[PDB]
């Protein structure tokens, strides 16, 4: 085999446990990476700037709604509220006025299903954590995705091994034994869609483009005018970027880089210039300021892409089956919360870095609309308060009296960082945010009814550790309040 003994084992795991070969096939090639001590570090002197992209703002054209007819819409759909304090699926929870971000992304498609394109697809990426749930969610609303959510809606993520940390084995843990494996990052996307035969399935169908994004962001909706701009530059893969700001670097950011490839067979060697994303745990500890430099790396991936479904088949049946991601090495122990279980490595792959593995591949700068995730109770209260509306197609944007700018909301760790808390606090009513410039709350708090904010307001409870209520039709205007 020339596979480690510890390679083995996990193939032997993975045999064993019926996963698909397109799986094991793709990890067992990152587990010899990791074998090899692949460090992974992408320092600034193998990478360059951006410099200049195109922006959804200056575009115009759209495109006719035959593409529309060709084009799938995926969404990811296996995680959790655990940020914020929900042990079930993230898209469930409710957003505006009983809706759910699953409603919305399913209202969107059948508006366009009935007013564009009947043949637009719609996928879900889901884990075995989240499958029964959106089924049973399907099944009472839309039972049109519920008939044939087997056969054509549903993609499941795959499950690989942890490994331990110093011998690369399969780790074992008899006290939960779910806890031995993991998904891989939301990079298996293309995994799942090739080991499943969906991707063939889609691509023999006639289905030409997919527009990923993750289902907890509520501004990645179908926009005709990407599908015009990939038509006409013929682009293979797009990214939607937004500038990044002071909060953001952090976070991941695009960049640029040559690269000399060998030719295999007869045909001769390639020079070219490749897109990619760096993330922190891949930028060396020096190249750390110019990794936070948002004036040098100005743009971070959305997760908001749009593929050639015919080019992505050539290309990972170029590669043996598979398409070869950067791997991150995930350190953890089995159990997360036993600090004392054997440490592990859970590897990971992301969907974005994608970008680095086709020839006609190109970012373009989008608002930060298209790029609303709901990571916090603050971000849910503007969300269901009436500083958001829905639009005839099932879009949820500003209330123009906010114009443009969205309420700030900054809410308490004590009480509010769980759903548990915030529940209590909007209990007989959520309070008007549409005129709020900025509102902070700390200490415990609960909300009336028929509650209006204007302004910059600030809400404080010392320590009272009691009731602190508001009463019913109170307005706040650039004030604090105080028991
Ligand atoms: O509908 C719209 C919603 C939001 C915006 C502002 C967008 C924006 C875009 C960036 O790349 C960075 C950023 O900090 C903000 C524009 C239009």
Not at 239 to 245: D, F, G, Y
Not at 294 to 299: A, G, T, V
Request: proline share 4%; with cysteine; aromatic share 8%.
């Amino acid at each position: 085999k020339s596979l480690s003994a510890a390679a083995q084992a996990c193939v032997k795991k993975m045999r064993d446990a019926k996963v698909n070969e397109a799986c094991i096939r793709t990890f067992i090639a990152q587990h010899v990476m990791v074998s090899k001590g692949e460090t992974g570090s992408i320092p600034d002197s193998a990478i360059m700037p951006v410099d200049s992209l195109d922006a959804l703002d200056s575009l115009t054209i759209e495109c006719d709604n035959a593409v529309l007819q060709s084009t799938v819409v995926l969404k990811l759909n296996g995680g959790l509220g655990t940020g914020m304090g929900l042990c079930d699926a993230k898209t469930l929870l409710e957003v505006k006025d009983g809706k759910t971000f699953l409603d919305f992304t399913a209202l969107q498609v059948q508006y366009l299903r009935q007013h564009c394109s009947e043949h637009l697809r719609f996928m879900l990426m889901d884990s075995f954590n989240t499958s029964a749930s959106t089924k049973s969610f399907l099944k009472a609303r839309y039972p049109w995705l519920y008939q044939v959510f087997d056969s054509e809606v549903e993609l499941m993520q795959n499950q690989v091994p942890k490994i331990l940390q110093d011998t690369l084995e399969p780790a074992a843990w008899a006290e939960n034994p779910a806890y031995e494996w993991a998904p891989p990052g939301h990079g298996d996307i293309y995994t799942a869609l090739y080991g499943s035969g969906k991707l063939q399935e889609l691509v023999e169908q006639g289905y030409r483009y997919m527009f990923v994004s993750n289902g907890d962001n509520l501004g990645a909706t179908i926009d005709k005018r990407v599908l015009a701009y990939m038509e006409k530059e013929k682009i293979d893969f797009l990214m939607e970027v937004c500038r990044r700001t002071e909060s953001d670097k952090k976070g991941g950011h695009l960049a640029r880089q040559t690269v000399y490839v060998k030719g295999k067979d007869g045909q001769p060697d390639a020079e070219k210039r490749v897109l990619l994303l760096r993330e922190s745990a891949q930028c060396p500890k020096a190249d750390m300021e110019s990794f936070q430099d948002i004036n040098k790396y100005s743009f971070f991936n959305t997760n908001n892409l749009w593929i050639r479904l015919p080019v992505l088949l050539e290309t990972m049946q170029e590669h043996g089956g598979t398409l070869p991601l950067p791997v991150i090495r995930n350190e953890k122990t089995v159990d997360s919360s036993n600090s004392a279980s054997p440490k592990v490595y859970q590897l990971e792959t992301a969907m974005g870095a994608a970008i680095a593995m086709f020839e006609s591949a190109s970012a373009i700068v989008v608002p930060r609309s298209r790029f609303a995730p709901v990571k916090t109770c603050a971000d849910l209260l503007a969300l269901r308060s009436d500083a958001y509306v829905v639009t005839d197609d099932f879009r949820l944007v500003l209330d123009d009296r906010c114009h443009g700018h969205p309420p700030v909301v900054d809410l308490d760790s004590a009480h509010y960082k769980m759903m548990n808390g915030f529940e209590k606090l909007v209990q007989h009513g959520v309070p008007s945010l549409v005129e709020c410039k900025r509102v902070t709350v700390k200490g415990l708090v609960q909300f009336g009814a028929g509650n209006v904010l204007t302004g910059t307001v600030t809400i404080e409870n010392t320590d009272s550790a009691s009731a602190f209520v508001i009463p019913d039709g109170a307005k706040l205007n650039d004030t604090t309040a105080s028991p």
